[PDB]
Structures are given as structure tokens and as C-alpha cells.
Paper text:
The Escherichia coli GntR-type transcriptional repressor, NanR, regulates sialic acid metabolism, but the mechanism is unclear.
Initial two-dimensional classifications revealed two distinct populations: population 1 that had three NanR dimers bound to DNA, consistent with a NanR-dimer3/DNA hetero-complex; and population 2 that had a mixture of one or two NanR dimers bound to DNA. 3D reconstruction of the NanR-dimer3/DNA hetero-complex within population 1 revealed sufficient density for the (GGTATA)3-repeat operator and three NanR dimers, confirming the stoichiometry from our analytical ultracentrifugation experiments. We could unambiguously rigid body fit two NanR dimers, solved in our initial cryo-EM experiments, at either end of the DNA. However, density for the central NanR dimer had a lower signal-to-noise ratio and was consequently less resolved. Despite this, the middle NanR dimer could be confidently placed as densities corresponding to the flanking α2- and α2ʹ-helices of the N-terminal domain were observed when looking from the bottom of the DNA toward the dimer interface (inset). Analogous to the DNA-bound structure above, we observe that each NanR dimer sits in an asymmetric pose relative to the DNA, approximately a half turn away from each other, which aligns with the location of each GGTATA repeat within the operator sequence. Furthermore, we identified that the α3-helix made primary contact with the major groove, while the wing motif interacted with the minor groove of DNA across all three NanR dimers. Although the resolution of this dataset does not allow us to accurately locate the N-terminal extensions or confidently define their role in the assembly process, we note that they would be well placed to form protein–protein interactions with the adjacent NanR dimers to stabilize the complex.
Author numbering:
A (entry chain E), D (entry chain F), E (entry chain C): 21 to 248
B (entry chain G), C (entry chain H), F (entry chain D): 30 to 248
The structure:
DNA sequence: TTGATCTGGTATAACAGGTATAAAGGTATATCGTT
DNA sequence: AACGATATACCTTTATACCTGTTATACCAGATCAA
């Protein structure tokens, strides 16, 4: 450890991991694979090989580096996706106990209402083409299977991408994944009429956005979320 | 892929299914490894990940246990997230903007189902909120209590958790606080809350949203 | 040429010769490379090709295994092929025309060797086929069951595979289905199947082929 | 990746390959070598050189580009030949187990009967010259070795080319290759008389086609396939 | 070229290739990739990049180096296989004109008779186990297809490997390849009885070798080559 | 793999099929490349390989032609092969041993079909062979003429080519020749050839093979 | 003598192979607990 | 006090990524031939 300090009983792995943390915080490395390999650091610190592996693995969990296969660690910063990855541990309890299912629906409804209100209020002359091509590519009836579902979720994503906030897209993807993960026994009984109703509601929504009237858009969105 | 994450999620869902309660009820990890056809460092990495999460307790050579409280992981995630500040100077305001997208989803709900049982509660809350006198201690406590009783109107435990999380996040983020400017800030805040509760009584969510937007713009 | 394809076909024929069963029975790929005088990226490309095909399983650092089921490559090829639609508008009908070249090779075979043991089977099949009532669920199932029991007359496993492949291909190709027109469609279909089985009993393959051509032209 | 996302443990090669797939599907490239070289894309994505090589190689297998030697990738569409190339993996089992040999023969017989019926029914006044010159160039007895075999397979090919379906010629070539690949110990014992019988049967077939009588043609074809 | 000599009209590629030849003959390099890459030599000689590529390519043809993929040239010596590779250009004429087919058969017969005579005369007490295990693994009747053919050619190879001459194995492999390349329409009509006759003849050959009587072995080999 | 070798073998088989005779009958290589979907350096490498082989002739900017004589490639291969001498000191004797495996396949053939028409030819050959007097000039010429008339007994053009190739190879390999020892060498050679022709007349291939082995062992 | 075409050489780009590094899994050893 | 089980650490193997080298293709320049 370049300082002659064993620290065996007090877990010497903490010493090397905090030394690596300090060396990274000292702005002595770049943003990629500037850090050496495992054997180089092992020989430089006169320690074991599995210790450095555990250190890096713990560091990745803490959200500091990233490794894939046959490449050194790439130092980065913990973004919004890292927080969502570290979370979701208690999400199973919410779907386990009877409640919470309506709470997630209410949260999603509030989020979508807020974002559609912001989009209708800050409606520029360029984002109209995005929603136009979205409703155009989601207008034809060619595949009544899962293609319409992915088209609808892509339309929702491009609608949520209007503000331009990295945390917004992250939480949107997280909520959509947590919602589609709790859809058991999906059957194709009345999904075609559901697709037609969704198309009509999207047409009404874009018409209300063009006319600058969030009331009708909010009513159509509430009706769509109540019809499920 | 990586075996580690597989057995990690397996033991996570096992401890979530309430298969083992308090104490050292887990079997020997050697025969677990022999049955799962995994490696020794994988189990050590899984235990280290669980220790970093804050669910098990390993000191010397004893076995792991369960952890019912969840306050350690909260401050852990707080310290881990409150770091991305020097990268984006104004992007933090985006996070503040997120708070907007939350509060605007609250003042427009009082006119939905609140009839009289919540009106008395918010009135008796704002009574003490206005009776408060201290600028740094009483006014901040009154403001957070008003925000809590506002978030508790729909009756949702997730909303309260999100609100307190945003509160502690902004508290850890903002490093400098004022006293003279905060006085007029909370003054205008409760002056606008008066109009907010007036519009709530009159069943007009537009005026409440406008007052909230003006309060957020006043900073 | 490319060394990769050579060792790929070599390991393919080796795993087809049943040299190694289930599990990690393959030796170390390092000495394999040393004996074959090949390169490191070639082995990685071969393993990636085998993973894309759906015969091996590599997640992290373990060894490859064998894969007995073949349902993943089926849907993989389905998704990979069901794409050339916007290039040729009517050329897809050519594929449908191919189906003709298959069905015309079936109705002309019942008069070859089927005497009575298949007649009872097709009769008890068409019984339930006509007893079906639902337009979108029962009629389509009855039609595919009749097509299956027709293709199973010569007793050929390849014919059944080709038939089910054409079925799933046309299902993935056609994006819009009807209910009112499909009713009369299957009505005329079984009305022509009546004449088809009559001609089969009378040992006349010409009338069956004419009825099949008329059914295909009716769309 | 122009988005600051490591994705090391989750195989970053999938990220770049799906990015390339999306860029190709966005109709931002032509149909040839419009895509840049390996070093250009490597420097643009700030990734490794072997990663882009593996991506392109995987893409070629999926059936999207094509490379030869010293030339950029040519984007195209997976035709019928690509499906046959991706298949044929289970064809060895059929020739391994005792059955299947008669099944392939029955399939080929059904295909040839259907195509000859279509040719006799849609017989125009122009395709007659093709079969005429075919039987003329396959009439003289100059080389009794493998020249007659290739003449016969060329006659079969030009007969199968009458409908004009790209998938038809593809499956015909595939079946002929899979059939000639399973002809062990080909000896020249009675191949001359076989050539004479084949010539007489082709004469009978073209006569039945001229007379518009598929029955005699089908009988002659059945006799030829039974005589082998 | 380190000497200030253009030699443009007289093909300067000859100058650099003869300089490389002299540098190699000066015993200044080892036996592997000791020579630098293409860019290093290009910058050292102040010439073009394709010129060095053509030089190395010509050198490989001359039989001096060897390249595969992503590796420097490995200097070696032209062995017997290089001569066979450079030859075989006029072998197509022999199979084109009617003669020569019996000439190759006579040459192969002379070669096999000479090698079997040498093996029977220099029969030691160790090579008997090789032929014993060969005839043992070629005795069972498990696959009457091409497995017996490859077993027979492996037996012929291990029989030709008795003297221990690198040129002998090279010319043996060359002759066997040139002979199997001229086997058109191989059919499985009487190959099983041919396999039984070959097994009996190999038994007679090994018995004559044990008894030290090359006459019976030569007669059996002549009968086998006449039966084809 | 390498495109170069493909088009090289293609043009080789094309010029072997006698598609183009003498002169510049080949078309423009630009449209050849456009039709073959190859590169420019590949055609240059193929032309360089053909020039090194000795089939085409390119000096400045003209087109390639055909080459009927094959004497240049002979000496080219001779110079290219006569180099591996310092590696294996005694392995060159293996090559000499190969010559054995050739000559032993000749003396045992005279008793097969030669009746009298070849006996007179070999007799009138050995007449002048013995009439020769010079040690370095006449005896070597007599020996090579006797070897030629021996190899020409079965009537095979390939055998003569192989014999002359071995002759020029051994001539280029052996750098030192003697005169006094070569005298007794050829003396014993023809003294053994006397017994060889005697055994050929008596129809006894064993004695001829023994005499040939003794001559080869005498060196 | 000038212009055009063809051939050859050089340079650049792309693909493939090999090597190195990192991560995961398995095995062994040590420590703690229970009988 | 001894034995067994569990946990942690270390080592080895496999996979992935990056870099380097080689080959092929394209472009430019020079030379030769024809008008």
C-alpha cells in the first residue's frame, strides 16, 4: 500500500478501495480506461489479485466504473439510471400487498398530465412534426398484435422526450418497465377496439394541443386511463 | 453472463418471500454452492453487495441475518447521489423542475374529493404555520409541515416517501441558506397559500396552479 | 478464404456427430486453437455465430453446452425473413403462389393410396370443423386442423414442418384480418371442401384440383 | 456512443450494433458503400476496432451488409438465398437417419410436377423456343461423361425458370445441390442408356406440352424418376 | 532506399525486393516475425505502402515468408509442399487429353510397390504395431459410406509413413489428391464388396509382410489396383 | 479469403481452355473488374504472379499474351528449389533415395513386355556407350543416354520428364565432380549393366534389382 | 507534338486475428459453533 | 476438545475488447501509342 500498513483484522480491502477513491477524486485520471489492468495495480500495491477484483466490483456497484469483457474499467459518474438500478428493491412489496397498484397508476397519471400540460403550454413550431410523424406511423392498421403496443409506447416516449430532461426519460422508462412487468395473462380479446379507441384519443389529444386547450386533452387522457 | 447477479437476485427474492425470519436461519453456503453449481468468489461478491445494500450483517465468521429498518440505505443513496453537481451547473434546476411536476399534481387534486374533513385539517395546520415566528427554525418547520399535510391529502404512502426524499435531497444539495431573504420568501409563500386555500374552497384549480407557478418563479 | 467458417463448420459437424452430450464437455479452446493454427478472434466469431444460431449458451466465463430444442431459431428466422415487404408490393403473392404449388401436390395424392383408414379420419375431422361456430377463433382453428390432417395423409414429418412454417410465415406477414368477410370465406372454403372430399371418394383428382384453384382465386 | 453510457457488464457491443441497426433503418444511407470505413466509425464512436469488426460480422450473418476484400460494407436486404444459407443445419440429420431420402424425392417430384403443370397450362408462344433450343443443345451425343449431366441440370433449371419467381429458382438450386451432395460412388456403368432414356422422356415431355396433355408428361416424369 | 537511386523506369520494386532478399540472406533476422510491419519499412525506405505489400506478396509466392491475418511475415524455407503448390499447372492438360490417366496409375503403382518392398525389407519390431492397429481399426463394419474410404486412405498414409521422408509424404498426399480430384460420378453400387475385397487384400499383404515374402504382397496389390 | 487467387485460377483455367490464342485477345481489365466485383491491386497481383510463373509478357503499357514454351519456369523452379542444402546435411541423400524408388521401378519392367524390339535398341545403345572413351564428357553422356533409353522403354512422356528433372536437379545440387574416381565409377556402372542386360535377357528381375542396389551402394 | 488511355504503384481503409485484462466461478483453508 | 459447516479469499479460465498487421481496392501519375 506504499505506506507499510497491514490492517489485516480491520479489512485491508477498505484501505485499498479508499485509496483508489482518493486517487480518482484527485483528478489524476481521465474518463476512460486510463487506469491500469488488474495485474499492474496488484504488482504496484503488493497485494492479492482477488482483492483488486473485489474492490473494482464494489466500486462498480457504488457507481464509479464500468466493465464489460476484455477491457479495463471506464470511470464515469452515477447517472439517473444508476439510482433506479440501485433502487427497485422494495418494489416487489408494493406488488405483493394488495394496495399500491392504484398508487402507481395515480403517480403515472399525474406525471403524464403534468408532461402533457407542459408540452401544450410550451408548444413550439418544431415539435409538432415529431408528434405528426408519430401519429402517422401509428395510424395504419398492418399488425394488430404487439406491434401496436410498441408503437404506442414509442409514441409515449417521444411525447415524454419533449421537455428534454435526462431524469425525465429515465423515470419514464422505469415506470413503463415496472408497469409492463405487472401485466399477467395478456390476452387478445378486445385489443383491436382498444387500439381504435387509443388512436381516436391520440387524435383528440393532438387536436387539443393544436387548439391550445389542455382541458379536452386531460379529459381524453383520463378516459383512456380509465378504460385501460 | 455473470453468475453473481443471478444468485444475488435469487437470495433477494427468497428473503423477500419471508422464508427465513430473524436470526441465523440460512443453511451452510457450501452446500448451497454445490447445489447451484457456482463459484466461491461469486458468493463472497453477493454477500458484499448485500452488506453494501444494508440487509445482512457480517463482522467476523458468523452467519448473516435480516434487516427490517431501511434508514441506512436511504442516507447511503443520498450520499451516493448528491455528487453530480459540478458537471451540470443549471441541470440541478431540472431536478427542481421535477419538484414542480410533483406539486402541480397536488393543488389540482383538492377540488376532486376533499369536501370538509381535509379543509379543517389544513386550516388548523396553517393556523400554527402562521403563528410561527422564527425565521430559520419555525418558518422552515411550518413550511415542511404544510407540504406534508398537502401531500397527505390523497392518502398515499408512496407520495409521502417521494416528498420526504425530495426534501432531504434538496437539503443536501443546497449548501448555502439565507435568513433575511428567506423571511420575505416564506412571507410571500404563505401570502400565496392564502390565495391557494381560497381557490380550493371556491373549487378553482386554475388559480391555485397559477399561484404555485408564481411562487416557484419567485424563488 | 476465411478461417472462421472452416472451424465453425468443423465444430458444427462435431456436435452433430454426437461426440459431446449435455454439459461442459468441450476441451480448452486454447489448445484447440494451437492445434488448428487459427486466431483468437476467429474462435470468438464462431462462438458468436453459434450463439446467434441458438446452439450454445455463454453468459459470463463458463463453457458452452448443447441445445436440444429448436424453437428459438424458428422465431428468429421468422423475424429475420418477415421484413421484405415494402420492396415488392405484389411479390409477396408469389410466396402465396408457392403455397399453391404445395396444396395442389396434396389433393391429387388422396386417390393414390388412401383407401378407407384416412377417409374416416378426415370425416371425423370435418365433423368438428363444421360443428365449429365462432368466426375468428373456431373457424380458423378448424381450417388449420383440416390443413394439418390433409398434410398428414402421406405420413411425412418434413411436410408438416413446411406446412406449419408457411402458416406462421403468412400469419406474421398479413397484418390485417377481417371477421365478416372471413365468415363467407370459410363458408365457401368448407363448401368447396365438401366437393373435394366427394371427388376424393369418387377417385377424381381433377375436380379436387379445380375446386382448390377456385378457392385460391376466390381469396 | 455519443451518449456517455458505458454498459460494460451488459455487453456494449449490443448497444453499438442496435445503434447501427437504427441508423440503417432511419433511411440515412443508400444501398452501397455509403457507410464509412472501420477506423472512421471507431473514431466517431470512441470505441475499439475489434468491436466494430465483430458488429459488422454479426450484421452480415443477420443478413444486412456484404463484404469481400478491400471494400466497405454494401447494405442490402436478406433475399431467399440468405434464408437457405442460414438453414441447412438440420439437413445432415435427415441424411444421417435412414428415412428422409424418400421424403426429399417425393418433395422434388411434387415440385417438378407442379411446375410442369403450370408450364403446360400457361404455355405461351415464346417459351417454346427456350425448350426447343434446350432439347436441341441436349440432343447431340458428343460427351457421354459429366457434360450430359450438366446439360440435363441446365435443362431442368431453364424449365424451372418458366414461371419467373426468384424464390422458385432459389429453392430449385438448393434442392438440386442437396440432392447431388448425397450421390456417393457415382459410376459409369449404365449412364449412356440412362442418357438415351432421359432424351426420349424429354422428347415425350415436350410433345405432351405441345399437345397440351399433362397426363402423358406426368407419366413420363414419374417413369424417369422411378428409373433413376 | 538509403542510397538515393530512383530507378523509376526500371521498376523500383525490383530494387526493394532484392534489397529485402539480400537483408534476409545476410542472416540479420530470425525465423519468425522479427521483420517490422508494413508502415515501419515504408517509413524507413521512404517509399509507398502498396509497393511493400506487392513485394511481400511476391516474396510469399517465391516461397520465403508466410502471412495469415493480423500478423507480421514469418520467414521460412521453401519445403517440398511449396514445390507442389507452385507446380500442378500442367496437370489439367494430362486429364484433358485422353492419355495420362494410365500413366498416373502406373506411377502410383510403381511408387506403392517400391514403398511396400522397402517396408517389407526394413521390417522392424516396432512398425508392426502401427499396421496392426491400422488393420484393426479398419476391420469393423460400422459405416459402409465414405468412412471406409477415409480409413483406407489413412491406412495408405500410415503405410507410406514407414520410411520417414518428408518429400515422400508430400508426394503421396499430392498424388492421392490429384487422383481423388479425377473421380467423377462416384456411386455406391458395388462398394461394399469392394471394401471386403480390400480388407482381404490388406490381410494378405500384412501376412506376406510378416512372412517376409514381397511376391504375394505385390500380386495382391496388383490385383487390387486392377480391380479398382 | 483472398480474392486474388480466385481470379488468378479463373484466368488460368480460361487460358487453359484455349479461349484466346496468340496476341492481345483479352478484353479491357477494367470491365472485367467491374463484372467480377474485385479490386485494382488484386488484378495487379494476379498479373505479377502470372509474370513470375512465365505465361504472360508485360513490359510497359501493352496487353498480356500467351506463352507456349515452358523452359523458363523449369530453370526458375530449379533455382528456387536448389537452396535447401545447409539445413539438412544428409537429408539430400533422401532425395537421392527417391531416385532409387524410381530406378528400381524400371529394371523390373523389362521382363514384363519387352520381347525383342527394345533389346536391339538397348544393345545398339550400349554399343556406343562402351565405345565411348572420354571420362568427363563421353562417359557422362553415355550414362545419361543409357538412362534415357531405359526410361523410354515403357513409352511414357511423364517418366522422361521426371527423369530429366531429377538429372538437372542432381546436377545443380552436386557442386564438386571428380575425374579419376568417376572413371572407376562408370567402369563398375557398365560392368553391372552387363549383368543387368544379361538378367533382362534371362527374364530374372531379382538379379537386376540386386545389381542396381549394389551400384547405388557403391556410390 | 499533343492528347488520351491503360497500367502500375502507392496509400488508405477495413477486416481478422491475437493478446491482454477483467470478471466470475470454484476450490481450499480457516474459524466458529455445537455436540 | 474435536468435527463439521460456512464463509471468504485466491487462483484459474474464459470471454470480450482493443490494437496491429495484412490485404484489397481505388486513385493518381507516367508512359506509350495514335492521330
Amino acid at each position: 500500500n506504499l505506506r507499510s500498513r497491514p490492517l489485516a483484522r480491520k479489512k485491508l480491502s477498505e484501505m485499498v478501495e479508499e485509496e483508489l477513491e482518493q486517487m480518482i477524486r484527485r483528478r489524476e485520471f481521465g474518463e476512460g480506461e486510463q487506469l491500469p489492468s488488474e495485474r499492474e495495480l496488484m504488482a504496484f500495491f503488493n497485494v492479492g489479485r482477488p482483492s483488486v477484483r473485489e474492490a473494482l466490483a464494489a466500486l462498480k456497484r457504488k457507481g464509479l466504473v464500468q466493465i464489460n469483457n476484455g477491457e479495463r474499467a471506464r470511470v464515469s459518474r452515477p447517472s439517473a439510471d444508476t439510482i433506479i438500478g440501485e433502487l427497485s428493491g422494495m418494489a416487489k412489496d408494493f406488488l405483493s400487498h394488495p394496495g399500491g397498484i392504484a398508487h402507481f397508476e395515480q403517480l403515472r397519471l399525474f406525471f403524464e398530465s403534468s408532461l402533457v400540460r407542459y408540452a401544450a403550454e410550451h408548444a413550439t413550431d418544431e415539435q409538432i412534426d415529431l408528434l405528426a410523424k408519430a401519429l402517422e406511423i401509428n395510424s395504419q392498421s398492418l399488425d394488430n398484435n404487439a406491434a401496436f403496443i410498441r408503437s404506442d409506447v414509442d409514441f409515449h416516449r417521444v411525447l415524454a422526450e419533449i421537455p428534454g430532461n435526462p431524469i425525465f426519460m429515465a423515470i419514464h422508462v422505469a415506470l413503463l418497465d415496472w408497469l409492463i412487468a405487472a401485466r399477467p395473462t395478456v390476452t387478445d380479446q378486445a385489443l383491436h377496439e382498444h387500439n381504435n379507441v387509443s388512436y381516436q384519443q391520440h387524435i383528440a389529444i393532438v387536436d387539443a394541443i393544436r387548439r391550445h386547450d389542455p382541458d379536452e386533452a386531460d379529459r381524453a387522457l383520463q378516459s383512456h386511463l380509465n378504460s385501460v
